[PDB]
Design a protein around this ligand. Sequence first.
Ligand SMILES: Nc1ncnc2c1ncn2[C@@H]1O[C@H](CSCCc2c[nH]nn2)[C@@H](O)[C@H]1O
Ligand SMILES: [Zn+2]
Ligand SMILES: [Zn+2]
Lengths: 298, 115
Amino acid sequence: SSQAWQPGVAMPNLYKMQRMLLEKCDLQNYGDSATLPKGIMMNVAKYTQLCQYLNTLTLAVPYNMRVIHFGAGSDKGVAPGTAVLRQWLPTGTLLVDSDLNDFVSDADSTLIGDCATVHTANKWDLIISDMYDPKTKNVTKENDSKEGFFTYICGFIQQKLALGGSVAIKITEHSWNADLYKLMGHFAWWTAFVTNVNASSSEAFLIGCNYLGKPREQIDGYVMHANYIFWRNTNPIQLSSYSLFDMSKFPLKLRGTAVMSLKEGQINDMILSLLSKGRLIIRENNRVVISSDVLVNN
Amino acid sequence: AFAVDAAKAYKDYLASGGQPITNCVKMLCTHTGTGQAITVTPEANMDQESFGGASCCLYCRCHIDHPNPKGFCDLKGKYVQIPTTCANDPVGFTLKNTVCTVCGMWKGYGCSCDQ
Ligand SMILES: Nc1ncnc2c1ncn2[C@@H]1O[C@H](CSCCc2c[nH]nn2)[C@@H](O)[C@H]1O
Ligand SMILES: [Zn+2]
Ligand SMILES: [Zn+2]
C-alpha cells in the first residue's frame, strides 16, 4: 500500500470486468478513522482528496468553466465541499450549488430545494454530487437500485452535461442506482474512487470522465455495483490523511480547452477522439441561467 | 430608525464569555501564501489559517442583512486569513479588525505601512 500517499484508491479495471453477485459490504477497516490535520473537517479533507484525484484525469477545463454542485449543504448550515471546489477551480469559474436544506455558501449562486426542482438553461462542464439520504442505510432490507435524486441526476447528465464534461457522483453500498452505472459507459473512461480519509466507509465517487453522449460500452448497473462491493470487500484500504499535507500542486490547471457549438450530425469520430482526450467541450457559450421551481400551496 | 445591531450583540456576547461561532470552514493549504487578509484563493502564511469566507461572515451565518446600502458581502466567495492565535473565533476576528487599503494585510496583524 503505496496507496497511502495517494489521495485515495480507484477501482482497478479488472474488478470492473467481473460478473459478481451482490453481497453485503463488510469492510475490515470499518469503524477506524483517519487522523485529520488539526481543526480540519472530514468533508474538507474528503473533497480535497477528490479534487487531488480529479487532477490526475483528462478533465476539460475551458475558460469560463461551468460547475454545478448538488448536495452542498451540511447539518452545520455551511458548504465545506463548495469551499474546496472554489479553491480548486480556476479563478473566474462559475460555481452553482444546491441542497434540500438552507445553507450559507461561497458559490456564485445557491438554490435551495429538492434537486428535482432545479432547472438550468445552459449546459455544464463538471457536475459534482454529494447527495445522500441516510435512510438508505437499512441493512435489514434487500439492496435494490435507488431512485429519488438518482433519477434526477441521470436525466440531468443526459440533458445538461456538455460533451467532453465530467461528473463525480457520491454513492455508498446502499445509495446507488443502476442507470447511473450504465451512464458511466457513456464517457470515455469511468471509475469508482474511494478517498483515503474515508476509506472505512462504503462511499465512493462514481466518476465519468469526458462525456460522449452515446454508449461507448454497455454496462449492467446491477452487476457493476456488485463488482464495486466485491472490490471493497476484498481490498481493505488503509485510512490515510497523508496527501492533505501537500497542497503545492492542488489547483486545477487552466487548460483553456476549446468550446464549440456543434449539431449532433457533426459529431464524427474525429470529434469523439478530441472529446475522449479532454481536448474539447461542446455546448453553447451564452449566459448561465438557473432556477428552482416553487410549489405554491395554502 | 430601528435597526438590529448584530455586530454589537456578538461582541457583547463574546465579552460576557459566550462560546464563539463554530464550524467556520478551514481550508487545507500550503501556509506559504502572501498573508493578505481577504483573497481569491487561500493565502495563509505560516502564522495564519485560511477559511471559506462565507462561513466567517456574521451576517451570512446569522441570516441577516449585510450592513451597507447594497447588501454586499466582501467575504462570501473569497478566503479570509485569520492569525492562528485568533482562529478559535474567525467571525469575531473579521468583525473587530480592518483591512489596510494599500497593502491588503490586516491592520496590526501584518500591515507594515506606518512603520
Ligand atoms: N433529493 C435531494 N435534493 C437535494 N438535496 C438532497 C436530496 N437528498 C439529499 N440531499 C442532500 O444531500 C446532502 C448529503 S450530506 C452533504 C454534506 C456536504 C456536502 N458538501 N460538504 N458537506 C444533505 O445536505 C441533503 O440535504
Ligand atoms: Zn456575508
Ligand atoms: Zn498596510
